């Protein structure tokens, strides 16, 4: 439609458009997205989900992999210890407000006709279009792993076994996505997330690196991080707080500053927001403790929910 445009919005890319197009024709339509349990859910994640949320307004059965085996698989732990961390992340995506089928990883991707599937992608796929595949995925080993190459292609075979019609993720998983669009015998559409840019200016947002503002995060908590961000006047590209204030913010929004400061600006959307940004009328300070502010009320709900 419309749908489609609703869809589009925010995305980087969609392979392909067309594809998605005729895939919203049908009358049963089914999409995916997996994540690696991660301890903090952020920004990064509930971008994602918005989109998911997205796909479920436009008549999409969605579908969320708890991948607790990939995970397992690039490093991150204990299989046992990466499930229970697989039950949080349900809670927080089910606090999040989007109706979804969850599901384990570690349920399915054991199943005979799964496993044996896996084989039959491993005898199509060189080492080295898994290897590239993984380059943006991988934890960084000075000697790779035999578990690195599997990890694509029991993601590739997730696409399968679902019976999805799409795939979403971030931008990093662009070639394991390709991938997907060549070993598989339904061609799925993927759908693409921009990567947020984490708190320090410092490429994306993540849960290692500490440069993230998390969904259950306590209001002083945002309120120190938004303040500690980089966020140079003027400057709107990897600025992390004007992309917040892009993806989660709505819009017509009042920033309360103080009348000897300029008064009381408010913004009838986020290109409003940027070309005061860009153009000196709106100081960091202002458009920090603005962002703050509206961010604590977007994930109260979320916040409030988990405990
Ligand atoms: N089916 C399926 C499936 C989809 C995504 C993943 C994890 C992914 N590579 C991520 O980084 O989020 C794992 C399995």
């Given at each position: 439609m419309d749908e489609f445009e609703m869809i589009?919005?925010?995305?980087?890319?969609?392979?392909?458009?067309?594809?998605?197009?005729?895939?919203?024709?049908?009358?049963?339509?089914?999409?995916?997205?997996?994540?690696?349990?991660?301890?903090?859910?952020?920004?990064?994640?509930?971008?994602?989900?918005?989109?998911?949320?997205?796909?479920?307004?436009?008549?999409?059965?969605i579908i969320i992999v708890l991948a607790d085996l990939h995970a397992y698989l690039n490093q991150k732990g204990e299989l046992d210890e990466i499930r229970k961390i697989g039950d949080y992340n349900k809670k927080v995506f089910e606090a999040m407000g989007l109706k979804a089928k969850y599901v384990y990883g570690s349920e399915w991707m054991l199943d005979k006709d799964y496993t044996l599937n896996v084989y039959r992608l491993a005898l199509k796929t060189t080492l080295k279009r898994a290897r590239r595949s993984m380059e943006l995925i991988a934890r960084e080993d000075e000697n790779p792993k035999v578990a690195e190459v599997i990890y694509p292609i029991m993601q590739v075979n997730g696409a399968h076994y679902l019976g999805v019609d799409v795939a979403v993720g971030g931008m990093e998983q662009r070639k394991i996505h390709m991938l997907?669009?060549?070993?598989?015998?339904?061609?799925?559409?993927?759908?693409?997330?921009?990567?947020?840019?984490?708190?320090?200016?410092?490429?994306?947002?993540?849960?290692?690196?500490?440069?993230?503002?998390?969904?259950?995060?306590?209001?002083?908590?945002?309120?120190?991080?938004?303040?500690?961000?980089?966020?140079?006047?003027?400057?709107?590209?990897?600025?992390?707080?004007?992309?917040?204030?892009?993806?989660?913010?709505?819009?017509?929004?009042?920033?309360?500053?103080?009348?000897?400061?300029?008064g009381d600006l408010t913004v009838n959307s986020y290109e409003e927001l940027e070309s005061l940004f860009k153009n000196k009328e709106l100081?960091?300070?202002?458009?920090?403790?603005?962002?703050?502010?509206?961010?604590?009320?977007?994930?109260?709900?979320?916040?409030?929910?988990?405990?």
């Open positions: 589009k919005r925010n995305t980087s890319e969609i392979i392909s458009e067309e594809e998605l197009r005729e895939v919203l024709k049908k009358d049963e339509k089914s999409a995916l997205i997996g994540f690696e349990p991660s301890g903090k859910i952020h920004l990064g994640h509930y971008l994602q989900i918005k989109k998911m949320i997205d796909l479920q307004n436009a008549g999409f059965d997907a669009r060549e070993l598989l015998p339904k061609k799925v559409v993927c759908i693409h997330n921009p990567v947020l840019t984490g708190l320090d200016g410092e490429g994306k947002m993540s849960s290692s690196k500490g440069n993230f503002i998390a969904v259950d995060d306590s209001p002083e908590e945002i309120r120190a991080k938004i303040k500690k961000a980089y966020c140079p006047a003027g400057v709107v590209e990897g600025n992390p707080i004007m992309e917040i204030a892009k993806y989660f913010l709505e819009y017509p929004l009042t920033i309360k500053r103080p009348e000897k400061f300029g100081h960091p300070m202002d458009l920090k403790n603005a962002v703050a502010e509206e961010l604590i009320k977007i994930l109260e709900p979320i916040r409030k929910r988990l405990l």
